Design a protein around this ligand. Structure first.
Ligand SMILES: [Cl-]
Ligand SMILES: [Cl-]
Ligand SMILES: [Cl-]
Ligand SMILES: [Cl-]
Ligand SMILES: [Cl-]
Ligand SMILES: [Cl-]
Ligand SMILES: [Cl-]
Ligand SMILES: [Cl-]
Ligand SMILES: [Cl-]
Ligand SMILES: [Cl-]
Ligand SMILES: [Cl-]
Ligand SMILES: [Cl-]
Ligand SMILES: [Cl-]
Ligand SMILES: [Cl-]
Ligand SMILES: [Cl-]
Ligand SMILES: [Cl-]
Ligand SMILES: [Cl-]
Ligand SMILES: [Cl-]
Ligand SMILES: [Cl-]
Ligand SMILES: [Cl-]
Ligand SMILES: [Cl-]
Ligand SMILES: [Cl-]
Ligand SMILES: [Cl-]
Ligand SMILES: [Cl-]
Ligand SMILES: [Cl-]
Ligand SMILES: [Cl-]
Ligand SMILES: [Cl-]
Ligand SMILES: [Cl-]
Ligand SMILES: [Cl-]
Ligand SMILES: [Cl-]
Lengths: 216, 216, 216, 216, 216, 216
């Protein structure tokens, strides 16, 4: 990583933490922020380091490769490189593969990240990676939000737990999520709680809904 | 975090400590100071990092989202943003979502936190988060202070333990807590200890009360 | 903590160490130095942090609260606050609650701790806390020094171990401790060792006493 | 290691991490980036340190020795040393054994790594080491990419996992890997999924192929 | 500790390491260097911290107290304090209790340790502590060097192990140790090895003696 | 240790790592680089610290003492000390015992290690220690290189593993090792592999030999 700005190598505890996260949690949504937390200030070299140390799950890692190549090709199309000798006071403009770390040295990445008018290649590559990771989290989610229904004896709290877990795995736009919250949550409750939630009103908070079905 | 003032990324041990705290202690009151201890000097990005890495408990995390949105709307109402181009020597005034970290970059948060006439967005957001966390601790408390009664064979120490545990989960105003201490504690003791505590006097310390029922 | 003088947040390993100490050792005397060791250079905020993270034992923590309030009231009586506007080059004088961290910000505590003519609020509050902790250690001690008697088959070393353990839990003045050492230790030994220790003389060291009853 | 540029010793956690990696993962491909991650900024002394601390696997370590000697002889052939006394403002040119750390002091390595017009002996030696490590990973791979065939009941995801694992162990040129991906993956699927993948088209992504055989 | 010179608090890992050392190894000789290793650069406050955190073994800790008081009284006798007001540019001369940390603040200890013409109170107190610790190691040693005899089937290596272990616990002067090595080691071997060692000669090394009885 | 140049105490993790290494691996060859890795930049005080903390194995530690005394006497013979008062701008020349840390303070060792025209006493003492450690590794090796023979069903890889393990324990000159490699390895293989290795040619690499007997 680079920290306030000086360069540093990725620590053993960071790398081992990421490896154990992938081992234990597979591709649960909370893996993605963890990743973003273990890669704060990372160069593309550190990100490739974290990705390459994953044993197994090679189908998902290959999908991530293809996503990264898509984003790199899009960056290349939007940022066409100009022909000409690089001036003494300048550094070359990065291609998509340079941002992915495969065609750029560590010194070039540091140069882009520190030089005035900064090109944050680490955060760009990081965004691409998180995009692919979200694709993988969605594809590996074993449930659909439409199938989450409260059991007749299920306490309301557990039903809300499952519901918002699956919803977190859905990863649709926030307006769609608001719609699912305002419709499916009360729609798919069990009769006892469903009646009370209907009696609450269309604009009640989650706190009011959970405290309304607490004794029930 | 930011430390004396320079910026730093949240450490692997900090994040893993928070995750394990949520795993083990659920929503016991002591979780809240622990959180505040693992987030000293945090930017809103670090706080969102700690919140997002929680797997499961998504009902509580959603309630926390709604509380944070309430506090953000209140901040927006009390701090109406002015229309105009931001001057070269200034930074824009933060909205509620900026303080929550969802509409502000890390550089903007650092800018607000370091610039003279400082706006401590991390401590504001931290206060909102602790507010919602207290709501969750209260809602998930399984006992009421009125139901804590000393058993006939229960040593006084254990009764006081349970009593002040539940009282810590009550989270009412301090005057109400003083009233509960001065009334319910002696009122709900077992006959043997209750008589002695009555003989002590209305203004005895907890040390005097516990040493009075020690042999008893 | 503040370290040579710059401010720092309490570390995850420190906090987890304190929590595990309270979990494992309850209120054994060695807990108190450990505490003082894990809080070297602490602001009142760090001390309140360490106290609040304790789950359970809420009777003892409440007793500690009452002791801290006693010491705070005494400080207020001895240091009556003067009425007047605080000058530009000065900081307000701290009340008892300010030293306890409940009515003072972190910046005010740092200000008192660093400014010339220093008011060490952290060490004052720390002294109050250690006072209450000693009260708790004494109240929770399950044995009296007068009941420690050597068994007929008990090796002298174990008897001395128990004796000075209980003595450490007694926490009377040092002259009283010297008296207990000079009287009860030989008085409550078993006949075999008691005779030899009588033959040693009234002014023998603990090394001489233990080596005198080593084979015996 | 050397870090931004000052010198440092290899940490206990780094060394123990490498040792445990070799113990647990043997010579799985993910060992190689891990190595490169635990050796970022290393002098040849640190690299020899990491190699020598490996207990057992001495056949592989000897093969690595022979590879390093090959690369050293090639460097010597391409960089013939000139006869003459080293000038006061200069340092001698490194031989192959100097880069391997066996004939150069730590001070000479630091001198080459820091002096302007830098000779990065640590990264050169590191490249040689990774070359030999790739040889060992290939030789110890127990499967060939041509033998990876999907079972009749095997979910497509697992088949892709095995396939790209073995492919990662193959370590042929990237064009050859592209050919294997475009031919063998669909060629060696089971009939059910093979038909659907044929119906997809010759230019479908891995995401489209896996989502096409998801229910199947 | 104080490190190159600035002051620092004793770390959680250091303290926990010392505690676990006392728990596991009791009073084996290797405890003493470990202590000296965990206390490098320590003020008397850090040393008292390490001593006080020991639970149990209070007989040994009391013996250590008495030894420290002996050394303190000797220091007081050899360094009689002069009567007079301390000058502005000076610090008072330390008594024995000041060196033991019981009558001196942390600031006074730092002052003595850093000021020119330095009084290393931490290393003096450390020497006293190691003296008492050696007394305890000797008293708690369960064997005498004269009783270490090689069994008829005991390999010579194990006999030498036991012998030099007990010898390390003896802690006599080095000339006495040389005598014990030159006499008792060969004297108390079993007949088979004893004859061969007699045939070696009076001035053979331990390597020659062990390789002479290796097959035997 | 001393690090780029300032002095530091040996860390708890370093010391515990060394102790656990000695506990687990006894005197396997890989212990020696580990030692050299845990002692990079060490003063003689740190090295004596690491040696003294070893419990048990006192025969080997005594042999190490005798080796260190041999090297010290040789240094004394080659560097005869001159009689005369040490000048204000100078430090005394070190004897053999000074380099071993037994007759020199930490300040004197730092002085020799930092002063221009440097005497690296830590690396000299370190070389002596590694010499004795190699003696111990050789003496405690339970096998001879001449007895390593491939079993009739033993895969060639395992045979090479054992062979180069024992060879690493032999620690003869590199030319002798080359001879053993070129003769004994093929000489002591089983008939099946031996014939093929004879058919390979006298100058084949270890990679070619192992891949020749891979299927066999
Ligand atoms: Cl790892
Ligand atoms: Cl994995
Ligand atoms: Cl998954
Ligand atoms: Cl890779
Ligand atoms: Cl579900
Ligand atoms: Cl984690
Ligand atoms: Cl959880
Ligand atoms: Cl809960
Ligand atoms: Cl998230
Ligand atoms: Cl209860
Ligand atoms: Cl914790
Ligand atoms: Cl607890
Ligand atoms: Cl207790
Ligand atoms: Cl609290
Ligand atoms: Cl007892
Ligand atoms: Cl290790
Ligand atoms: Cl291994
Ligand atoms: Cl392998
Ligand atoms: Cl080696
Ligand atoms: Cl397979
Ligand atoms: Cl501890
Ligand atoms: Cl203990
Ligand atoms: Cl012992
Ligand atoms: Cl104490
Ligand atoms: Cl023995
Ligand atoms: Cl240790
Ligand atoms: Cl050991
Ligand atoms: Cl061994
Ligand atoms: Cl020693
Ligand atoms: Cl073998």
């Amino acid at each position: 990583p680079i920290v306030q700005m000086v360069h540093q190598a990725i620590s053993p505890r960071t790398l081992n933490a990421w490896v154990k996260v992938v081992e234990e949690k597979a591709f649960s949504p909370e893996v993605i922020p963890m990743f973003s937390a273990l890669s704060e200030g990372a160069t593309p070299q550190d990100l490739n380091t974290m990705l390459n140390t994953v044993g197994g799950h090679q189908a998902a890692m290959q999908m991530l490769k293809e996503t990264i190549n898509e984003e790199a090709a899009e960056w290349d199309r939007l940022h066409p490189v100009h022909a000409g000798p690089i001036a003494p006071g300048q550094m070359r403009e990065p291609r998509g593969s340079d941002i992915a770390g495969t065609t750029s040295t560590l010194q070039e990445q540091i140069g882009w990240m520190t030089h005035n008018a900064p090109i944050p290649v680490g955060e760009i590559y990081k965004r691409w990676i998180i995009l692919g990771l979200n694709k993988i989290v969605r594809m590996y989610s074993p449930t659909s939000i439409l199938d989450i229904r409260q059991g007749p004896k299920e306490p309301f709290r557990d039903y809300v737990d499952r519901f918002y877990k699956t919803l977190r795995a859905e990863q649709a736009s926030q307006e769609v999520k608001n719609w699912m919250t305002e419709t499916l949550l009360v729609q798919n409750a069990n009769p006892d709680c469903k009646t009370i939630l209907k009696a609450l009103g269309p604009g009640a908070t989650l706190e009011e809904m959970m405290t309304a079905c607490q004794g029930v």
